[PDB]
Nucleic acid binder design. Sequence first.
DNA 1: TAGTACTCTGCCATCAGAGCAAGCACTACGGCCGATTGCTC
DNA 2: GATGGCAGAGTACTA
RNA 3: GGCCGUAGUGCUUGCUCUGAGUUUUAGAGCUAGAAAUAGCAAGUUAAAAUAAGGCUAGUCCGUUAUCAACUUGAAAAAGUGGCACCGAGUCGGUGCGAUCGUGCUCAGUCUG
Lengths: 453, 1313
Amino acid sequence: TWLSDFPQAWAETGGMGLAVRQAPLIIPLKATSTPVSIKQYPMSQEARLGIKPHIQRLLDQGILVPCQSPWNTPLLPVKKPGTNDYRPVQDLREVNKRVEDIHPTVPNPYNLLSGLPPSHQWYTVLDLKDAFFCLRLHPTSQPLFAFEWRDPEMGISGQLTWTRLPQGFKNSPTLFNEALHRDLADFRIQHPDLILLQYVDDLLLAATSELDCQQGTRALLQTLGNLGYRASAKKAQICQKQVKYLGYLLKEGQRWLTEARKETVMGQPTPKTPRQLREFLGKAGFCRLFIPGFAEMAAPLYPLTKPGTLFNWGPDQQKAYQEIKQALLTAPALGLPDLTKPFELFVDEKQGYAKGVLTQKLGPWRRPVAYLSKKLDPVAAGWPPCLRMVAAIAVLTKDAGKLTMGQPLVILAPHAVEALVKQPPARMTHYQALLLDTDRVQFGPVVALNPAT
Amino acid sequence: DKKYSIGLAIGTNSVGWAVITDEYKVPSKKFKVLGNTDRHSIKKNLIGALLFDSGETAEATRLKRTARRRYTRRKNRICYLQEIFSNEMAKVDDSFFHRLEESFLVEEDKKHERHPIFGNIVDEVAYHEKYPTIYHLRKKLVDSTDKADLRLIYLALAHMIKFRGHFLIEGDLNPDNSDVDKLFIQLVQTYNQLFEENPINASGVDAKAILSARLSKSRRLENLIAQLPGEKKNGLFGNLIALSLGLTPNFKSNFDLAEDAKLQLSKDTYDDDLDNLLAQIGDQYADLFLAAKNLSDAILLSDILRVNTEITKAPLSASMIKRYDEHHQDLTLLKALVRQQLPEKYKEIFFDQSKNGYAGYIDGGASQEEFYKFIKPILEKMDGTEELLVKLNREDLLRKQRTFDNGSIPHQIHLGELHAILRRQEDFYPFLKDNREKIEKILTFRIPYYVGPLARGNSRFAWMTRKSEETITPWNFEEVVDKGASAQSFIERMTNFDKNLPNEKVLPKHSLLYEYFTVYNELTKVKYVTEGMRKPAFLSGEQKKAIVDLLFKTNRKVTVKQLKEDYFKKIETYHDLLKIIKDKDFLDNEENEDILEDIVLTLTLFEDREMIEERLKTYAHLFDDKVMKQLKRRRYTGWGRLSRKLINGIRDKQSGKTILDFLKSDGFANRNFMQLIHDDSLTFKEDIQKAQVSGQGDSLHEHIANLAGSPAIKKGILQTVKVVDELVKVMGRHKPENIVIEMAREKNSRERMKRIEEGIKELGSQILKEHPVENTQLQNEKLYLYYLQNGRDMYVDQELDINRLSDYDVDAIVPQSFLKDDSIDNKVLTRSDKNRGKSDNVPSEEVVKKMKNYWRQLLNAKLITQRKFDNLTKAERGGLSELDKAGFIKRQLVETRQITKHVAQILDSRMNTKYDENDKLIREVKVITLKSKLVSDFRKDFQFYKVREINNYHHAHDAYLNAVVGTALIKKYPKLESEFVYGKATAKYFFYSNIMNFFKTEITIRKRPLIETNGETGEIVWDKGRDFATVRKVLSMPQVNIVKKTEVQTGGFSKESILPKRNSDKLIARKKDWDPKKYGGFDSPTVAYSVLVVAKVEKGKSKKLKSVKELLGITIMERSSFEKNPIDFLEAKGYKEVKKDLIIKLPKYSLFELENGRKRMLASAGELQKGNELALPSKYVNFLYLASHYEKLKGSPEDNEQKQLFVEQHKHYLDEIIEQISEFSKRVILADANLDKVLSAYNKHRDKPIREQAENIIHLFTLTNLGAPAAFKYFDTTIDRKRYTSTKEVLDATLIHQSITGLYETRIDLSQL
DNA sequence: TAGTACTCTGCCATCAGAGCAAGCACTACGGCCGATTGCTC
DNA sequence: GATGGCAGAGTACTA
RNA sequence: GGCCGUAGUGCUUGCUCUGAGUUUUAGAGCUAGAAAUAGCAAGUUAAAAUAAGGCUAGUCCGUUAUCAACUUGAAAAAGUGGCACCGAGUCGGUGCGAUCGUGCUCAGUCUG
């Protein structure tokens, strides 16, 4: 029934989108930027025949228009990982380098989920289909994105150009972020209670109760409807407690991991080549935050990553692989942090490796915010025990300076070391400034933390 | 991407290469194969070598070109004579010249009568009866006074003009001077008449025998001086005798002239020198000098004419006629004697053309020496042959008129005979009266060596300039060819440019500016010390000016005492012109420096007095006639290494002062030339750099051609550059870290024979006369040393015996340990080596003192060289000092050859090209040059023994070891980069003796650590545990890419010998109209390249078209015609419907793969060569080396004993080596008869010692080798060549096109097409 | 049987000299030809 | 000096 | 590494010349024998060619150097070929193969 109520917001019924608020935008060029023309690279018979149906339907939507421009880049098909659809890719390699650089105001995935509070339990995730195509392109800057296309079947040759912001452009996520932010800035004012989370094009609205989410949903569908943006009804988790966003599961105000992601890590067989291990370490690097002390767990596999070495899969290596497989099976539920609160950093060391959990108050309990782990730099790892803790607290607190958004936090440790920092019997002076900053750093009561949790 | 290094070994006909990684492991990658075969990939190791034929010098080509020019000019001379005679010959006998041209023609081909002179048989026979030889006619024409037939006159003149004689003697010759004793007596009479105070007596002296002796001119002069009282050498009479006999004496001491005034009698300038000397002394010595000239003429003529010239005006023709008569009389006497005593050998002597004798001497090709050798025993074994034997011994028996010894006849004799003929016959022939001068000019004209070829702009060798555009004949040569400009260009085309200013020519060495520059450079570095000086001070500009003006501009040699007295006490080329022009203000003036430069340049450029005087005429008004004459007399020789623009033209930007100006006005700084050109603040360095930038560099081939060295070495260098580029491309366009390179260090019997003959003649001994030695015998080292040492010991005073040779010892003057020189200049043959004294130094002082006189005599006899003498007498100088020993030890390891430096520079410029911010080149690739001693020592120390007879893998192994050793050395010792990478006595001695001691586990006993580290860094440069195993594994790999460079043959068409007529299709016509079957011709044409042709031929009477596939040899002569029209060329040969697409060009050494890996290389269109290499195991290689005792034994007695025990325990390896050879031959060589003979010889020679068996088994690898088959010898048995003279089987094989490294291949299967 | 047709074996190849000029490479000696930093007056 | 041409003697298959 | 001074050796490039050597023809072979054959006599010299030849037509040039295959070019020239590991009888087998941010590991450079 949701599709019926808002015909102006859904892509399956609303048709093509168009930003009716944003003006046409001129894409600037650096001093040495010149209209480089590259001939269309040879393409296979079936390949061309794969993109060809898309061009016909992209012509109907008005996305592709004939033009005569000095700029020209070779089109390139990329077949999907499954079946064969031959998606069209502009391959704007050369033009991407040359276009004037603009700062990437995009929000980093670490910090978006930090803004979600556990109080807002009802979620509604809306995808924005053809997001980059919403913004219109100025006819002065339209000649920039022309690409040579040949279609002898319909006799349509020449260089089609984009009247909207194309994909594969370096400024597209940035130009769309600011453009979308201004339109939704007025919406946030009208509904202070709702929490709107935006990642490039994906928007997530957080509300207190279910009705608020429903009411927010309806209002958002209409605000975006007037603005021209079209939302995908095929993939839109609306008024559901369990939603998936930013590759994470948001259940009961917590950050879980997708079960499909866990299967992939365990699914892979024992790696046999440095490329095989690189795929596994990078894939499981995403899930490093859920596995406390993962750095120590995946310690044996790190030296095997070096380009010059022998890939000897010893029993110790197999033991490290098995630990990660078993660790991901019973991964806990990391809670969502709360900026409007203090943090408690628990630090510990053993054998040159630093490990700890950043936590915040949730009811009477402590909820983990992130599991932080780093290796101690050689000179520090070599020190005796009761000062290796100083370096341990330092590197972990450094990681905090990326999730706490600069909010003040308290540090507790089994050994009182603040007085040692003041009078340690260059780098230490750098350590002194960071550790002694009472505005952001504080030393709490001495206590011993759980060996495992 | 992986860091790697390239190791190279360059030979004259081989270039090995190797790519190694950090762990000294040779990589291996799959390589795609192109072509139509089913093989699409192949695995190969990055190790191999490139073999090519050695390059050649242009000496033979230059000789051939000169011969061609000479023949052309001779035909032109004959044509000029014919042009002179043409009108009168047309009046007399019109077809005479036509008959002359077609003398070389068979009867059916001539369009005139066969008899060429008179045209009828009666007249021809009568003429030949009257004049049996041309010399009879020449003498008759000279002597008779009546009319002579015009054809006879033309024949005599043509013979004289065609065969002129040598131009060694300049001036004029009077044949009337023939008696030696009479002229000597006349000279003595004139000398006594003039020098009345001290008369000279020469009675009772055999002047003829003394002066006409066969010894050297100096020896004859010494003998005459000894046998003459009242005078000795360097006296007036001695100088006169030397001048007459040909030596150049200095008459300065005779008249106290204070100038050399040397006179050479055969030189062209003798008349001018004599005129100057007479003007210096007086007019009363003209008679003495004229007598000396007549005596010289008699001396030089009597050795040739050997006949009485008082009755005839043709002494040479009379001599030839008397030779003819003696030949006839001796022939009759020999015929009669042989008939009387040995009638049974008459047939073989006077009738058998094959065997030597008279028949082979006249009709056959036997020479005079061979005839004498055959006929000496027969004459000895007869009675009444005493006078014939005397004539045989003096080499005067049965002599033809045209012989090899006729090369000593001056052209002046022929000129005199021709002049006499013309004088006799000009009364009846007015045209002979008119053209006498021009006929003589035809005879006596020769193009000057500085004029060169007379081209007109289409010759690369010519440089001549014509003042008028018209045909040059000998009569208007002076009026057409610009001799002065031609000579200047001749000199200038060869002189060097300044290296600092590549576009500027160098100054003459004796130029005034050059002299000032050298003197000022020498003077500015002298720091004077005298009283009242706190510290030494440098001379100021004004002080140097005063010193130069007061000392150098006054006396030739300036010394320190003269400087102190004439300057510090009195006050505190230039000289040659001062005594000639007698003008000081002119020489010191500054506006005439151009005139002085022009004068010295003229004297340097021109060697002919007429040229100098015609060039100096522009300055004749400045001087007087006598000054001009003296200037013409003086001549300088030499060219400097600095340009005038560099010395005085360029000026500093800041001060506007030239280099010479700065050098004069140095002041306290006193900076010399090198400091001036290397000063950063001064602009001289910047201007020099700017000039060198212009032109940049030519092509790589042009640069290598411009390099100096052997052509074979240059070819090897180019091949190495190409393989470097190819390897860089192979490895992914990644440049290597290091490139370690190394280069090998490198009729003679006729030269040795001529040298020993000259030395014996100079010394006056008769060792060669005691027992003559042939050149092949003289090629032996011991015999050559014994003969060079005059048959006497060199270390002690005693006599050696030739029959006792092969028992003495050859001792090197410099010990072999310090310097490895095996040349004759360092080798010495003595009875006992212990006579030299200590074995680790120069021969002892006592021996040097004993043999100093003998060595000096040998040096004066040119038997030993100056370097050998200096090395021998080094004990007197002080012997081998410790610093000398250290330098000798160090220079054995550090490469110092300029050719190696050039190779390193070329590779470095090619590889490293990037520049830093401060224009400093980044040394991404380090080029290291090593000597072969390091690698050879490594092999000897660590059992990597090398045997060259096994196969060609040793080139690749040498390259690999070069890379490994160089990389390890520069890793361990970064401080050695200065002496290796292109870019105290005790301490230096022991440093370079143990530079390679870090490889070995034990020293002398020092327990060196197993793992070698850099020190100051954690770098492992070596690992004795595993790196030796890696090297052994690399050396034992069976796959190594050996490539023979295919080439297209170019050069001579065929063998130069002209064969007689025979009914064979192989003969080649010498001219287009001369049929080989009737005239003879060449044979054995050289094949440029084979062409695979698929066509059809007509076979049988029906001429049916049979499909044929075959190889056609396109010889060198017909290559251009084939390339112009292949279709027509092939159709003319008989093939129809050929296929241009299927035509394949096949150069030499084209590789074919047949079956079981058997490979054949195309030797020619009808021959093949082996193309497979035997990969014998390293265990067998080491056993063969140790058993064969290569280079004798060079190990300690403890180590020597254990190696013999190793050989004894491994005796049975010989059978396995034979088994390997046999199976390789059966699989590849397929020479069944030779294999069976080899096996039979081995079986019969099984009982002989292991040493002999191994030494002879080394020879057996000649059977299984790569290249042309060769004959070898196993003990007594000799095995001939098994040549593959059939190219039929290769038509179904696979043709492989290999790149320069063999990693890129294109296999073309010829079976399909 | 005659006639090609391919195979194996031994012989065989142009060679001597005379000047002249320029240059390089090596030997054997006998002299002259950096720049920066630290310490001292 | 060495390696490819050539003549000649020898043996074999075919028309 | 260069440039002076002396001395020597070896080699290279270019030019101008000389003497031979080779090939064909001319230099009447005679006598006794049908013929082969036999017996005697005679012999020394000359002409021409000396890379075929070419065009530019000169008293010029013609044996040095350079040259795998394929594609593009008139030509000069430029391009064309995956990597790792385990082995070794001329090489084989096995395995792998457009952008913006964020996480991890590692390298290099600069500075103090």
